[PDB]
Symmetry: C2
């Protein structure tokens, strides 16, 4: 029984569409995804993808869902905002450093 | 005029519609993306998990996340995080090296 069928009460049949990606030892993975995206959407979105991309797709969904559970307002957009601010700060600092270095290089 | 959610769902946008303050008619693709990725029912319930003063930010985040998954159906906005993780590390390395070079100009 995969994590999905355990959660969903149903028997986990050969070819259960979640079993390849929701093992029972990771209950949190399916609970978060179901709460944020919904089991039906996930089946729909996985069917739209090449089979060889579905493992990475599930991993991304699980990451996004977990971030949504722990930060209901921003989810992982919060991380993106934090990282974008730090890029800006560092690029500003690098600007000053590069001009200082260029002045030294000119004698 | 019905909000973008009610126009998409082909239902009457009534006074008190939970979507109307956040899905204006001028931005139909915003709702279409959020509906595809999260679903109207999930957004309805999340919006009611939140106080009024956070709903606008929540929808903004959902919209960005859904648009990212339309553009990148595999990784979504996690691809952005991966890129930003690499870039921050790289810029920090470059800045540390520049500070080291500056000190050698003054001391070495
Ligand atoms: Zn199963
Ligand atoms: Zn409406």
């Amino acid at each position: 029984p995969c994590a999905a069928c355990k959660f969903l009460r149903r028997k986990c049949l050969p070819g259960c569409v979640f079993a390849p990606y929701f093992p029972p030892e990771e209950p949190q993975k399916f609970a978060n995804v179901h709460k944020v995206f919904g089991a039906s959407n996930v089946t729909k979105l996985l069917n739209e993808l090449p089979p060889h991309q579905r493992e990475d797709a599930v991993s991304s969904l699980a990451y996004e869902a977990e971030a949504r559970v722990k930060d209901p307002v921003y989810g992982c957009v919060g991380a993106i905002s934090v990282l974008q601010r730090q890029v800006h700060r560092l690029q500003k600092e690098l600007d000053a450093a590069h001009t200082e270095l260029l002045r030294y290089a000119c004698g």
